[PDB]
Design a protein around this ligand. Structure first.
Ligand SMILES: [Ca+2]
Ligand SMILES: [Mg+2]
Ligand SMILES: [Mg+2]
Length: 430
DNA sequence: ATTATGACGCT
DNA sequence: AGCGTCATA
């Protein structure tokens, strides 16, 4: 009743760049614009592995993780851009720098949490309040929401996509009560107005297009963002949740796409998020633990409290290379040479990070994989990171891992190494 | 032979 | 600490 929290206290958005690495390459090379194209890494093995795909190329069935040679079978005219290679390995600097461009623009509008290289959560609660004041009970025009979808509308008693969008928008705005500054639906709507403006700014100042979700929390905002891509934004109201969740596979909700989601489905014998409402909080805790159970109980009702953390910079700076199949490292000279290549890229990124961001990493984490192990990482060891020097870091990395060498011969390395990873962590102000 | 990352949870 | 899970291009 009057004491039941509805999780409508905040306005939260999730902004996600459309086919990000592709857009970075298309800005640089106009010949790639408005074409089926993809970004690939390496080239020798099956034409390279695809890591990003334009919407034009997706229409042919091209996807992430596909070999370019196979993608070319679906899309003969597919254009490719290759990730830069430095020191024998893929180098993602261009994309990291493009990400910074976008994150800095978003930060002008509100506090953001960097969620990945191409997405950020935005806490719009305060900005919405401000804007509501300037508004002075004034109605919100559809013209202010030119790329917004209202999930679940239109409904009730045109055959084009943009027509449906506008019909839904009209029904929503027609129902809106603007004299109530505390109406959660109004708050979301003003949130959407602001996100339109943020998205226009990103495009104007970078050339990049993105999509966005606007709701009352991070999980719903993230889900909303994916509902209408590319180049559009979607508002998911509290009221829209029961219908939305009634047919939403559990695995679509962030954090349930893996083993836990699978167990929820298996143990409870359900398929859709909405079916969770029929269990008690204690029942859910009994199966999935205290934390996950409480989270599930609230989430299936559209409620979640994870804050947008004020963090625009990554917490770690890492460098990784796989050495698949026959390329696995089997000699000490090999292992040392590659530890050095990695350490050299790490040093470059760390030094730049110190100058830009006034901080210094203090821990070096070294991880390897050995041939045969099914896990992504076989062994993780840490040592002190006291100086930004590539020769030192690589020597230290070798020191922490050298005991892994089963070989009776000092010069040989067995079992061969299929992955090396150096990560700088535990930053302190400087 | 997806790869190269990056955040957070468990014990 | 070191391992595991889930997620990004
Ligand atoms: Ca994206
Ligand atoms: Mg993304
Ligand atoms: Mg993606």
């Amino acid at each position: 009743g009057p004491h039941m929290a509805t999780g409508q206290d905040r306005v939260v958005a999730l902004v996600d760049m459309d086919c990000f690495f592709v857009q970075v390459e298309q800005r640089q090379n106009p010949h790639l614009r408005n074409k089926p194209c993809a970004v690939v890494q390496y080239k020798s093995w099956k034409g390279g592995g695809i890591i990003a795909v334009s919407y034009e190329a997706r229409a042919f069935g091209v996807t992430r993780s596909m070999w370019a040679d196979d993608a070319k079978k679906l899309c003969p005219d597919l254009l490719l851009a290759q990730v830069r290679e430095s020191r024998g390995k893929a180098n993602l600097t261009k994309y990291r720098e493009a990400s910074v461009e976008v994150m800095e623009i978003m930060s002008r509008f509100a506090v953001i949490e960097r969620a990945s290289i191409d997405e950020a959560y935005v806490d719009l609660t305060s900005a919405v309040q401000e804007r509501l004041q300037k508004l002075q009970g004034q109605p919100i025009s559809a013209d202010l929401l030119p790329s917004t979808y209202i999930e679940g509308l239109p409904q009730g008693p045109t055959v084009q996509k943009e027509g449906m969008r506008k019909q839904g928008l009209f029904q929503w705005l027609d129902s809106l009560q603007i004299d109530n500054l505390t109406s959660p639906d109004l708050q979301l709507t003003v949130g959407a107005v602001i996100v339109e403006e943020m998205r226009a700014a990103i495009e104007r100042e970078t050339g990049f297009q993105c999509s966005a979700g606007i709701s009352h929390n991070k999980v719903l905002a993230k889900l909303a963002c994916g509902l209408n891509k590319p180049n559009r934004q979607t508002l998911v109201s509290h009221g829209s949740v029961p219908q939305l969740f009634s047919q939403m596979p559990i695995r679509k909700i962030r954090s349930l796409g893996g083993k836990l989601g699978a167990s929820v489905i298996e143990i409870l014998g359900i398929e859709y998020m909405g079916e969770l409402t029929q269990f008690t909080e204690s029942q859910l805790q009994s199966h999935f633990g205290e934390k996950n159970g409480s989270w599930l109980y609230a989430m299936c009702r559209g409620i979640e409290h994870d804050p947008v953390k004020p963090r625009q910079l990554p917490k770690t700076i890492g460098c990784s290379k796989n050495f698949p199949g026959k390329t696995a490292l089997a000699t000490r000279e090999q292992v040392q040479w590659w530890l050095l290549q990695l350490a050299q890229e790490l040093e470059e990124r760390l030094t730049k990070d110190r100058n830009d961001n006034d901080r210094v990493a203090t821990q070096l984490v070294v991880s390897i994989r050995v041939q045969g192990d099914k896990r992504l990482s076989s062994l993780r060891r840490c040592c002190a990171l006291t100086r930004y020097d590539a020769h030192k870091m690589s020597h230290d990395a070798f020191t922490v891992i050298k005991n892994c060498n089963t070989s009776g011969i000092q010069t040989e390395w067995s079992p061969p190494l299929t992955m090396l990873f150096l990560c700088a962590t535990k930053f302190s102000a400087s």
